[PDB]
Amino acid sequence: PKIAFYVGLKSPHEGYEVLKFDDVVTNLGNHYDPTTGKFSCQVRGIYFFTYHILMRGGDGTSMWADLCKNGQVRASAIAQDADQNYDYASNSVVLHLDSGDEVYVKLDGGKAHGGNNNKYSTFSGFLLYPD
Amino acid sequence: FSGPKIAFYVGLKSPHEGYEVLKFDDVVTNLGNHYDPTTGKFSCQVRGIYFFTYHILMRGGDGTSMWADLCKNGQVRASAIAQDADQNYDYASNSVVLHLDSGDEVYVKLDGGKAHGGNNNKYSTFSGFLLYPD
Amino acid sequence: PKIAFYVGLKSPHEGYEVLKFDDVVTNLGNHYDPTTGKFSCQVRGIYFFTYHILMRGGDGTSMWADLCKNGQVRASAIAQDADQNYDYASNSVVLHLDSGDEVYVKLDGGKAHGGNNNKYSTFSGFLLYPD
């Protein structure tokens, strides 16, 4: 089986519950759902994910972009801002997934920037080894 | 992960411009010899799904913003904006998964800054590999 | 052979010789050894690695996170934020490994930050193509 996706933002989005990437560049298997913002596992196995978020949140308060699986943080990234030189929040993971597990990016204390033409905020993943 | 084996990882022997294309000349891995450091482009011979990632140490930005773009046949498919200037560098990075037809080219281009690195200090990188052939 | 790992940091660590990631999230094959901090190849082939280190200790100097194979740097990342906050140092490689080769992250000029709670600093890798 062949499962891989790469998605970005068609406009700035907030991500209080989930950052809903809506610019879908690659979606092999159709397992990423832009209406929910989640990648839902249909093949049990080992996956790679990576994200890279351009975050704005004003002030001088920290901000985070987390990768979640089923509501548990599996990687986190803290960004400052420093409204001058923004911040990107990024990380990468290898995770084991069961069928029905949900993987997504969540924002804490800041907004994600990007658009159709400037694909700044991205999220990708693919299946490494099926069980 | 079964058919042909294609993967590359490259960097800079010295600082380079890349206004049309950043020509990484430090070839660490080049399974299949499909990255060409004379053109700075990865050229697909195997139709399928590919992962790419890049991480460019940029400076020279006066005060303005600079960009590192990943292109495919002249179309930007990912961007990173870097806004340091005051002194020293800032990184511009991204990752993508793209479908390629035979003969498509993938490469990194720069706007408003210069990529830094050297065999000494492998700061600026470009890597990719085939995930699934069609 | 399914060989992949994702590891993070349970507490702040030095990494002047090797950053010993101690939060083992994924370790297919058990080839990453949290006691040494090294991933160790018994299957020769082509591997992807990526790392993302949140560092501190930059006074008026830069800091580095380097990815090494058998003592040789194969990727470097310079981090320069000092006056305030923290700064990430990150990179990705594709490398051929011989059986026995050791891959690990090494720091210079600063200290890695994190917790099992604050999962900021990460290291991941997987076998792409066995020879």
Curated annotation (Swiss-Prot), chains A, C:
PTM: Glycosylated, but not with N-linked glycans.
Subcellular location, record wording: Secreted
Organism domain of life: Eukaryota
Domain named C1q: residues: 1-131
Tissue: Highest expression in eye, followed by placenta and brain, intermediate expression in adipose tissue and lowest expression in lymph node and testis.
Subunit structure: Forms homotrimers which can further assemble to form higher-order oligomeric complexes. Interacts with ADGRB3. May interact with ERFE. Forms heterooligomers with C1QL3 and C1QL4, when proteins are coexpressed; this interaction does not occur after secretion.
Function per UniProt: May regulate the number of excitatory synapses that are formed on hippocampus neurons. Has no effect on inhibitory synapses.
Protein's recorded name: Complement C1q-like protein 2
Organism of provenance: Mus musculus (Mouse)
